Each structure stands twice: as structure tokens, then as C-alpha cells.
Tab-separated table of N, CA and C in Angstrom:
chain	number	residue	atom	x	y	z
R	683	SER	N	-307.922	119.641	-175.265
R	683	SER	CA	-308.117	119.678	-176.745
R	683	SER	C	-309.585	119.863	-177.165
R	684	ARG	N	-309.781	120.114	-178.454
R	684	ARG	CA	-311.105	120.226	-179.042
R	684	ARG	C	-311.098	119.589	-180.418
R	685	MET	N	-312.135	118.821	-180.733
R	685	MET	CA	-312.258	118.273	-182.073
R	685	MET	C	-312.336	119.417	-183.071
R	686	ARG	N	-311.874	119.148	-184.285
R	686	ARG	CA	-312.163	120.001	-185.425
R	686	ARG	C	-313.652	119.851	-185.779
R	687	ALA	N	-314.353	120.968	-185.942
R	687	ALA	CA	-315.755	120.924	-186.327
R	687	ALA	C	-315.873	121.016	-187.844
R	688	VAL	N	-316.893	120.378	-188.415
R	688	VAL	CA	-317.096	120.401	-189.863
R	688	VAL	C	-318.572	120.450	-190.205
R	689	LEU	N	-318.935	121.379	-191.094
R	689	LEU	CA	-320.303	121.492	-191.589
R	689	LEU	C	-320.644	120.308	-192.465
R	690	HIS	N	-321.683	119.571	-192.105
R	690	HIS	CA	-322.229	118.577	-193.008
R	690	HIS	C	-323.142	119.235	-194.040
R	691	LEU	N	-323.365	118.526	-195.137
R	691	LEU	CA	-324.194	119.011	-196.221
R	691	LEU	C	-325.656	119.194	-195.766
R	692	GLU	N	-326.037	118.495	-194.705
R	692	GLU	CA	-327.384	118.615	-194.166
R	692	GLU	C	-327.560	119.913	-193.378
R	693	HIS	N	-326.487	120.396	-192.760
R	693	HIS	CA	-326.540	121.670	-192.056
R	693	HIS	C	-326.704	122.772	-193.080
R	694	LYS	N	-326.026	122.614	-194.210
R	694	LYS	CA	-326.178	123.546	-195.304
R	694	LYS	C	-327.612	123.532	-195.796
R	695	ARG	N	-328.181	122.338	-195.930
R	695	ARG	CA	-329.540	122.189	-196.435
R	695	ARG	C	-330.536	122.833	-195.500
R	696	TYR	N	-330.351	122.630	-194.207
R	696	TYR	CA	-331.257	123.200	-193.232
R	696	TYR	C	-331.213	124.722	-193.259
R	697	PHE	N	-330.027	125.302	-193.466
R	697	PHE	CA	-329.888	126.761	-193.511
R	697	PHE	C	-330.442	127.319	-194.819
R	698	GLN	N	-330.170	126.625	-195.917
R	698	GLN	CA	-330.706	127.019	-197.205
R	698	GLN	C	-332.224	126.992	-197.119
R	699	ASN	N	-332.739	125.996	-196.417
R	699	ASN	CA	-334.166	125.775	-196.392
R	699	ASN	C	-334.873	126.747	-195.451
R	700	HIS	N	-334.314	126.976	-194.271
R	700	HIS	CA	-334.976	127.812	-193.273
R	700	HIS	C	-334.393	129.218	-193.131
R	701	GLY	N	-333.228	129.444	-193.723
R	701	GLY	CA	-332.551	130.716	-193.597
R	701	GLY	C	-331.931	130.936	-192.228
R	702	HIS	N	-331.811	129.868	-191.452
R	702	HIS	CA	-331.068	129.914	-190.202
R	702	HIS	C	-330.670	128.488	-189.783
R	703	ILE	N	-329.881	128.370	-188.719
R	703	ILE	CA	-329.495	127.064	-188.178
R	703	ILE	C	-328.852	127.227	-186.811
R	704	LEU	N	-329.181	126.306	-185.922
R	704	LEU	CA	-328.813	126.392	-184.523
R	704	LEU	C	-327.883	125.223	-184.206
R	705	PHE	N	-326.774	125.499	-183.534
R	705	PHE	CA	-325.771	124.477	-183.272
R	705	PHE	C	-325.542	124.395	-181.780
R	706	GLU	N	-325.632	123.190	-181.225
R	706	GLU	CA	-325.210	122.982	-179.847
R	706	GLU	C	-323.683	122.982	-179.781
R	707	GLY	N	-323.146	123.471	-178.669
R	707	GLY	CA	-321.706	123.508	-178.475
R	707	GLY	C	-320.944	124.029	-179.679
R	708	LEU	N	-321.415	125.125	-180.264
R	708	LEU	CA	-320.724	125.736	-181.397
R	708	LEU	C	-319.325	126.194	-180.985
R	709	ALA	N	-319.261	126.913	-179.870
R	709	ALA	CA	-318.003	127.404	-179.332
R	709	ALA	C	-317.807	126.831	-177.930
R	710	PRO	N	-316.554	126.756	-177.465
R	710	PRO	CA	-316.332	126.172	-176.139
R	710	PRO	C	-316.997	126.967	-175.026
R	711	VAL	N	-317.657	126.266	-174.111
R	711	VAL	CA	-318.257	126.912	-172.956
R	711	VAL	C	-317.213	127.690	-172.145
R	712	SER	N	-315.953	127.273	-172.204
R	712	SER	CA	-314.905	127.918	-171.410
R	712	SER	C	-314.553	129.306	-171.937
R	713	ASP	N	-314.354	129.409	-173.244
R	713	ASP	CA	-314.097	130.695	-173.872
R	713	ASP	C	-315.298	131.605	-173.682
R	714	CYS	N	-316.486	131.008	-173.680
R	714	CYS	CA	-317.732	131.757	-173.564
R	714	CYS	C	-317.909	132.414	-172.206
R	715	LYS	N	-317.999	131.614	-171.146
R	715	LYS	CA	-318.047	132.152	-169.790
R	715	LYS	C	-316.890	133.129	-169.561
R	716	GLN	N	-315.708	132.768	-170.047
R	716	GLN	CA	-314.511	133.558	-169.807
R	716	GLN	C	-314.609	134.931	-170.465
R	717	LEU	N	-315.292	134.992	-171.601
R	717	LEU	CA	-315.490	136.250	-172.309
R	717	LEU	C	-316.556	137.065	-171.600
R	718	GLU	N	-317.610	136.387	-171.168
R	718	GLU	CA	-318.695	137.057	-170.491
R	718	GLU	C	-318.201	137.695	-169.209
R	719	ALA	N	-317.192	137.083	-168.596
R	719	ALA	CA	-316.605	137.601	-167.363
R	719	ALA	C	-315.885	138.917	-167.628
R	720	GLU	N	-315.170	138.989	-168.744
R	720	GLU	CA	-314.497	140.220	-169.147
R	720	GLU	C	-315.488	141.285	-169.611
R	721	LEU	N	-316.653	140.850	-170.076
R	721	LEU	CA	-317.658	141.783	-170.554
R	721	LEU	C	-318.389	142.430	-169.383
R	722	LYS	N	-318.703	141.644	-168.357
R	722	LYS	CA	-319.373	142.174	-167.173
R	722	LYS	C	-318.471	143.165	-166.456
R	723	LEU	N	-317.174	143.016	-166.688
R	723	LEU	CA	-316.166	143.834	-166.036
R	723	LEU	C	-315.978	145.139	-166.792
R	724	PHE	N	-315.720	145.011	-168.090
R	724	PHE	CA	-315.492	146.147	-168.975
R	724	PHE	C	-316.452	147.305	-168.707
R	725	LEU	N	-317.561	147.032	-168.024
R	725	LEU	CA	-318.490	148.088	-167.646
R	725	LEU	C	-317.910	148.925	-166.514
R	726	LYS	N	-317.090	149.906	-166.901
R	726	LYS	CA	-316.419	150.828	-165.983
R	726	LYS	C	-316.462	150.351	-164.534
R	727	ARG	N	-322.988	153.094	-177.297
R	727	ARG	CA	-323.302	152.408	-176.050
R	727	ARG	C	-322.194	151.424	-175.696
R	728	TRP	N	-322.174	151.013	-174.432
R	728	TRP	CA	-321.159	150.096	-173.939
R	728	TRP	C	-321.205	148.769	-174.686
R	729	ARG	N	-322.408	148.314	-175.026
R	729	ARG	CA	-322.579	146.967	-175.548
R	729	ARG	C	-322.313	146.837	-177.036
R	730	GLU	N	-322.020	147.934	-177.716
R	730	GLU	CA	-321.790	147.847	-179.152
R	730	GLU	C	-320.315	147.674	-179.483
R	731	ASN	N	-320.033	146.724	-180.361
R	731	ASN	CA	-318.674	146.461	-180.800
R	731	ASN	C	-317.718	146.249	-179.631
R	732	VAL	N	-318.078	145.323	-178.761
R	732	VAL	CA	-317.198	144.954	-177.670
R	732	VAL	C	-315.888	144.354	-178.181
R	733	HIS	N	-315.844	143.930	-179.440
R	733	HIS	CA	-314.623	143.348	-179.989
R	733	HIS	C	-313.514	144.371	-180.164
R	734	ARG	N	-313.870	145.647	-180.114
R	734	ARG	CA	-312.886	146.711	-180.252
R	734	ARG	C	-312.240	147.023	-178.902
R	735	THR	N	-312.715	146.360	-177.852
R	735	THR	CA	-312.103	146.503	-176.535
R	735	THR	C	-311.594	145.170	-175.979
R	736	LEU	N	-312.214	144.075	-176.402
R	736	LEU	CA	-311.872	142.748	-175.908
R	736	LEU	C	-311.365	141.864	-177.036
R	737	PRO	N	-310.148	141.314	-176.882
R	737	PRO	CA	-309.553	140.436	-177.896
R	737	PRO	C	-310.275	139.105	-177.967
R	738	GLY	N	-311.075	138.810	-176.948
R	738	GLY	CA	-311.729	137.522	-176.826
R	738	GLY	C	-312.779	137.284	-177.895
R	739	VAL	N	-313.389	138.357	-178.371
R	739	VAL	CA	-314.419	138.228	-179.375
R	739	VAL	C	-313.810	137.702	-180.670
R	740	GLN	N	-312.794	138.386	-181.182
R	740	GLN	CA	-312.183	137.983	-182.444
R	740	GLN	C	-311.453	136.648	-182.321
R	741	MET	N	-311.070	136.265	-181.114
R	741	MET	CA	-310.427	134.973	-180.940
R	741	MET	C	-311.427	133.839	-181.061
R	742	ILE	N	-312.610	134.024	-180.498
R	742	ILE	CA	-313.660	133.048	-180.697
R	742	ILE	C	-314.073	132.989	-182.173
R	743	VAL	N	-314.273	134.141	-182.804
R	743	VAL	CA	-314.637	134.150	-184.213
R	743	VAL	C	-313.584	133.416	-185.033
R	744	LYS	N	-312.316	133.727	-184.787
R	744	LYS	CA	-311.217	133.186	-185.591
R	744	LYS	C	-310.888	131.732	-185.247
R	745	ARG	N	-310.998	131.375	-183.971
R	745	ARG	CA	-310.593	130.046	-183.505
R	745	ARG	C	-311.693	128.995	-183.607
R	746	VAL	N	-312.943	129.440	-183.690
R	746	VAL	CA	-314.066	128.545	-183.938
R	746	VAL	C	-314.440	128.635	-185.418
R	747	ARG	N	-313.705	129.461	-186.146
R	747	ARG	CA	-313.864	129.575	-187.592
R	747	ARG	C	-315.273	130.019	-188.008
R	748	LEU	N	-315.956	130.730	-187.120
R	748	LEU	CA	-317.290	131.237	-187.400
R	748	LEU	C	-317.346	132.001	-188.706
R	749	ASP	N	-316.293	132.754	-188.993
R	749	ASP	CA	-316.197	133.511	-190.235
R	749	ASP	C	-316.244	132.613	-191.468
R	750	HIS	N	-315.506	131.505	-191.431
R	750	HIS	CA	-315.427	130.585	-192.561
R	750	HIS	C	-316.693	129.781	-192.668
R	751	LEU	N	-317.280	129.488	-191.512
R	751	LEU	CA	-318.514	128.730	-191.432
R	751	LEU	C	-319.663	129.545	-191.992
R	752	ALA	N	-319.709	130.812	-191.597
R	752	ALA	CA	-320.675	131.778	-192.101
R	752	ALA	C	-320.600	131.866	-193.614
R	753	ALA	N	-319.385	131.993	-194.137
R	753	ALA	CA	-319.176	132.095	-195.572
R	753	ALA	C	-319.604	130.808	-196.252
R	754	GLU	N	-319.375	129.688	-195.591
R	754	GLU	CA	-319.682	128.406	-196.198
R	754	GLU	C	-321.186	128.230	-196.336
R	755	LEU	N	-321.917	128.565	-195.274
R	755	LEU	CA	-323.378	128.482	-195.288
R	755	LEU	C	-323.983	129.399	-196.352
R	756	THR	N	-323.391	130.573	-196.549
R	756	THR	CA	-323.965	131.580	-197.434
R	756	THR	C	-323.333	131.573	-198.826
R	757	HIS	N	-322.484	130.587	-199.097
R	757	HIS	CA	-321.788	130.506	-200.381
R	757	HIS	C	-321.100	131.813	-200.742
R	758	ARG	N	-320.360	132.371	-199.794
R	758	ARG	CA	-319.517	133.531	-200.054
R	758	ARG	C	-318.056	133.118	-199.967
R	759	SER	N	-317.201	133.830	-200.687
R	759	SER	CA	-315.781	133.534	-200.687
R	759	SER	C	-315.227	133.827	-199.309
R	760	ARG	N	-315.534	135.012	-198.810
R	760	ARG	CA	-315.009	135.455	-197.545
R	760	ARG	C	-316.016	136.383	-196.900
R	761	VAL	N	-316.243	136.208	-195.608
R	761	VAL	CA	-316.906	137.223	-194.811
R	761	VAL	C	-315.975	137.594	-193.678
R	762	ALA	N	-316.244	138.735	-193.052
R	762	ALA	CA	-315.454	139.207	-191.924
R	762	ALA	C	-316.384	139.833	-190.899
R	763	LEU	N	-315.973	139.821	-189.640
R	763	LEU	CA	-316.738	140.462	-188.585
R	763	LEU	C	-316.671	141.978	-188.749
R	764	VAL	N	-317.824	142.644	-188.790
R	764	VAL	CA	-317.857	144.098	-188.951
R	764	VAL	C	-318.529	144.811	-187.789
R	765	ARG	N	-319.327	144.091	-187.016
R	765	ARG	CA	-320.058	144.701	-185.912
R	765	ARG	C	-320.425	143.619	-184.933
R	766	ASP	N	-320.743	144.011	-183.703
R	766	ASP	CA	-321.289	143.077	-182.723
R	766	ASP	C	-322.104	143.802	-181.657
R	767	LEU	N	-322.812	143.035	-180.842
R	767	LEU	CA	-323.574	143.603	-179.744
R	767	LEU	C	-323.656	142.584	-178.630
R	768	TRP	N	-323.301	143.010	-177.431
R	768	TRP	CA	-323.544	142.214	-176.265
R	768	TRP	C	-324.964	142.473	-175.777
R	769	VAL	N	-325.852	141.490	-175.922
R	769	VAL	CA	-327.247	141.648	-175.490
R	769	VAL	C	-327.588	140.808	-174.260
R	770	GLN	N	-328.543	141.299	-173.473
R	770	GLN	CA	-329.025	140.597	-172.288
R	770	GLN	C	-330.337	139.878	-172.587
R	771	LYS	N	-331.065	140.354	-173.595
R	771	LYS	CA	-332.328	139.730	-173.994
R	771	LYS	C	-332.570	139.828	-175.506
R	772	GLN	N	-333.336	138.886	-176.039
R	772	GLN	CA	-333.539	138.749	-177.482
R	772	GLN	C	-334.092	139.984	-178.211
R	773	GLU	N	-334.823	140.848	-177.513
R	773	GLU	CA	-335.457	141.989	-178.176
R	773	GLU	C	-334.419	143.040	-178.573
R	774	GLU	N	-333.203	142.880	-178.068
R	774	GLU	CA	-332.129	143.813	-178.374
R	774	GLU	C	-331.437	143.474	-179.687
R	775	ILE	N	-331.871	142.400	-180.341
R	775	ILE	CA	-331.296	142.031	-181.626
R	775	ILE	C	-332.143	142.619	-182.733
R	776	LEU	N	-331.673	143.727	-183.291
R	776	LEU	CA	-332.430	144.474	-184.283
R	776	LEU	C	-331.987	144.068	-185.675
R	777	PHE	N	-332.761	144.443	-186.684
R	777	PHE	CA	-332.433	144.045	-188.036
R	777	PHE	C	-331.033	144.499	-188.412
R	778	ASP	N	-330.304	143.631	-189.096
R	778	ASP	CA	-329.041	144.016	-189.711
R	778	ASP	C	-329.041	143.404	-191.095
R	779	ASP	N	-328.456	144.109	-192.046
R	779	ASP	CA	-328.495	143.671	-193.430
R	779	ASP	C	-327.195	142.997	-193.864
R	780	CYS	N	-326.371	142.576	-192.907
R	780	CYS	CA	-325.111	141.909	-193.239
R	780	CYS	C	-325.401	140.582	-193.928
R	781	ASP	N	-324.368	139.948	-194.471
R	781	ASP	CA	-324.540	138.654	-195.121
R	781	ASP	C	-325.090	137.618	-194.156
R	782	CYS	N	-324.453	137.499	-192.997
R	782	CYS	CA	-324.819	136.478	-192.019
R	782	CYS	C	-324.526	136.964	-190.613
R	783	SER	N	-325.452	136.702	-189.707
R	783	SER	CA	-325.216	136.930	-188.296
R	783	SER	C	-325.087	135.593	-187.588
R	784	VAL	N	-324.438	135.623	-186.435
R	784	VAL	CA	-324.376	134.471	-185.569
R	784	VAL	C	-324.674	134.948	-184.172
R	785	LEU	N	-325.719	134.421	-183.553
R	785	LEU	CA	-325.926	134.683	-182.146
R	785	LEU	C	-325.177	133.621	-181.356
R	786	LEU	N	-324.439	134.052	-180.348
R	786	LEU	CA	-323.656	133.138	-179.547
R	786	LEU	C	-324.053	133.328	-178.101
R	787	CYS	N	-324.542	132.270	-177.473
R	787	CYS	CA	-324.927	132.362	-176.080
R	787	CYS	C	-323.699	132.242	-175.186
R	788	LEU	N	-323.577	133.139	-174.215
R	788	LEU	CA	-322.365	133.190	-173.407
R	788	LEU	C	-322.487	132.433	-172.094
R	789	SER	N	-323.693	132.360	-171.542
R	789	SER	CA	-323.880	131.750	-170.230
R	789	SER	C	-325.175	130.962	-170.142
R	790	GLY	N	-325.296	130.181	-169.072
R	790	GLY	CA	-326.507	129.437	-168.790
R	790	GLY	C	-326.473	128.041	-169.373
R	791	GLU	N	-327.613	127.361	-169.311
R	791	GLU	CA	-327.757	126.036	-169.893
R	791	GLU	C	-327.189	126.038	-171.306
R	792	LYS	N	-327.650	126.999	-172.100
R	792	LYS	CA	-327.385	127.032	-173.531
R	792	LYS	C	-326.082	127.735	-173.899
R	793	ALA	N	-325.153	127.850	-172.958
R	793	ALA	CA	-323.879	128.518	-173.229
R	793	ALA	C	-323.075	127.804	-174.322
R	794	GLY	N	-322.326	128.570	-175.109
R	794	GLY	CA	-321.583	128.020	-176.225
R	794	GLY	C	-322.456	127.673	-177.418
R	795	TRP	N	-323.777	127.742	-177.251
R	795	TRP	CA	-324.711	127.476	-178.347
R	795	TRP	C	-324.727	128.657	-179.309
R	796	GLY	N	-324.837	128.376	-180.603
R	796	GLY	CA	-324.785	129.426	-181.602
R	796	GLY	C	-325.796	129.281	-182.720
R	797	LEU	N	-326.350	130.416	-183.129
R	797	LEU	CA	-327.364	130.483	-184.168
R	797	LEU	C	-326.846	131.302	-185.344
R	798	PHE	N	-326.775	130.705	-186.531
R	798	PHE	CA	-326.496	131.445	-187.759
R	798	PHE	C	-327.809	131.841	-188.407
R	799	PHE	N	-327.874	133.035	-188.974
R	799	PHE	CA	-329.099	133.480	-189.630
R	799	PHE	C	-328.852	134.775	-190.388
R	800	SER	N	-329.626	135.030	-191.429
R	800	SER	CA	-329.577	136.347	-192.051
R	800	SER	C	-330.901	137.049	-191.809
R	801	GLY	N	-330.913	138.366	-191.974
R	801	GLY	CA	-332.104	139.159	-191.720
R	801	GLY	C	-332.420	139.351	-190.249
R	802	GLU	N	-333.705	139.346	-189.925
R	802	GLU	CA	-334.152	139.572	-188.560
R	802	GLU	C	-334.026	138.302	-187.734
R	803	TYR	N	-333.652	138.469	-186.476
R	803	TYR	CA	-333.528	137.339	-185.574
R	803	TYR	C	-334.800	136.495	-185.614
R	804	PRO	N	-334.669	135.156	-185.771
R	804	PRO	CA	-335.821	134.232	-185.779
R	804	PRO	C	-336.436	134.060	-184.392
R	805	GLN	N	-337.680	134.509	-184.262
R	805	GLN	CA	-338.316	134.697	-182.962
R	805	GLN	C	-338.299	133.451	-182.066
R	806	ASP	N	-338.813	132.336	-182.573
R	806	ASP	CA	-339.010	131.147	-181.749
R	806	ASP	C	-337.999	130.023	-181.954
R	807	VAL	N	-336.764	130.357	-182.306
R	807	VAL	CA	-335.741	129.333	-182.489
R	807	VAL	C	-334.836	129.212	-181.259
R	808	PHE	N	-334.464	130.333	-180.666
R	808	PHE	CA	-333.525	130.277	-179.560
R	808	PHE	C	-333.750	131.378	-178.534
R	809	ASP	N	-333.716	131.007	-177.261
R	809	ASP	CA	-333.735	132.005	-176.206
R	809	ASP	C	-333.006	131.504	-174.971
R	810	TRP	N	-332.651	132.441	-174.101
R	810	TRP	CA	-331.805	132.148	-172.951
R	810	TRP	C	-332.359	132.821	-171.698
R	811	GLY	N	-332.156	132.185	-170.546
R	811	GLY	CA	-332.691	132.678	-169.286
R	811	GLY	C	-332.469	134.161	-169.052
R	812	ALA	N	-333.278	134.744	-168.176
R	812	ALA	CA	-333.186	136.169	-167.885
R	812	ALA	C	-331.842	136.536	-167.256
R	813	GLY	N	-331.135	135.543	-166.729
R	813	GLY	CA	-329.845	135.791	-166.110
R	813	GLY	C	-328.704	135.660	-167.098
R	814	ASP	N	-329.035	135.248	-168.316
R	814	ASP	CA	-328.025	134.944	-169.317
R	814	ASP	C	-327.868	136.067	-170.327
R	815	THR	N	-326.648	136.228	-170.815
R	815	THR	CA	-326.388	137.176	-171.875
R	815	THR	C	-325.912	136.420	-173.095
R	816	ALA	N	-325.892	137.112	-174.220
R	816	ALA	CA	-325.360	136.565	-175.446
R	816	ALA	C	-324.709	137.702	-176.204
R	817	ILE	N	-324.060	137.368	-177.305
R	817	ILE	CA	-323.435	138.373	-178.137
R	817	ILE	C	-323.806	138.080	-179.579
R	818	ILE	N	-324.183	139.120	-180.306
R	818	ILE	CA	-324.595	138.949	-181.681
R	818	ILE	C	-323.471	139.450	-182.567
R	819	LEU	N	-323.099	138.638	-183.553
R	819	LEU	CA	-321.957	138.913	-184.418
R	819	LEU	C	-322.404	139.107	-185.865
R	820	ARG	N	-322.068	140.252	-186.450
R	820	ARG	CA	-322.423	140.542	-187.833
R	820	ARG	C	-321.249	140.318	-188.783
R	821	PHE	N	-321.445	139.453	-189.768
R	821	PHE	CA	-320.410	139.134	-190.739
R	821	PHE	C	-320.797	139.643	-192.119
R	822	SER	N	-319.876	140.337	-192.773
R	822	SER	CA	-320.138	140.928	-194.070
R	822	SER	C	-319.062	140.578	-195.090
R	823	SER	N	-319.452	140.541	-196.363
R	823	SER	CA	-318.510	140.321	-197.457
R	823	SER	C	-318.268	141.600	-198.256
């Protein structure tokens, strides 16, 4: 089982205040590693919109309620996943003008960890070992 997660008003405050927020254990480490395993395989750009080939992406978004959480932080009625990127390093996260992005770490110490943010990726908030990958999720209203 997994507890139901709930945004506290302080998480909202931190995001309103800094324009981003970082959550430990945002998504289950099991779904994460398990998705990364299918991603390393899917390699016969390849890394763009992996959700159009792997059901695991939209299942994490839908089952961890990232979409509703994103909307809640940004005071939107509804957002939806419109794009994604499987990245190996932080410099691959380029500007996107969507309502809210969520970086989700797939492997390593920081696996299952997730960062919500709008605009350009926040340089010194989150990073992952050279052996680790992550996936960036763009949510739009």
C-alpha cells in the first residue's frame, strides 16, 4: 500500500514564494526504477515524449496525481501532461512555457524525488548522480 499524499498550505506558500518546490518520495521508488528499466530498453529524438510509447509515464502522473497537484500549486482548474523528456543530466532541461513542470528523478539516492517549477529549471535546487536519469514532465492548461 501507499499513503494518500496531500499538499499542505505551507507547500503552497513555498511554491508561491520561490516559484518551485522539491518533494522527497513524491512518487514510489518502485514505479520509478521500473519505468527507467523500460526506458533504457525502449532504445531499440528517442528521449522526447516517452509517454507516447510507455504507459508507465501517464500511470505515474495519474496515480501520483501530479496533474492535480500541479494544478493545485498553480491555482489552475485543470492541467494535463502535454510533453516530456527523459534526461540524463540537468543541462538537458530547456525552457518550457507550460503552466508547471515537474522533474522526477528515476534512479539513485534521490529516486522518486520530484521538483515542481515553472519557467527555467532552478539551477541549484536539485541534481542527480552521473549514473542517474530523470524525466521532465510538462503540464499545461
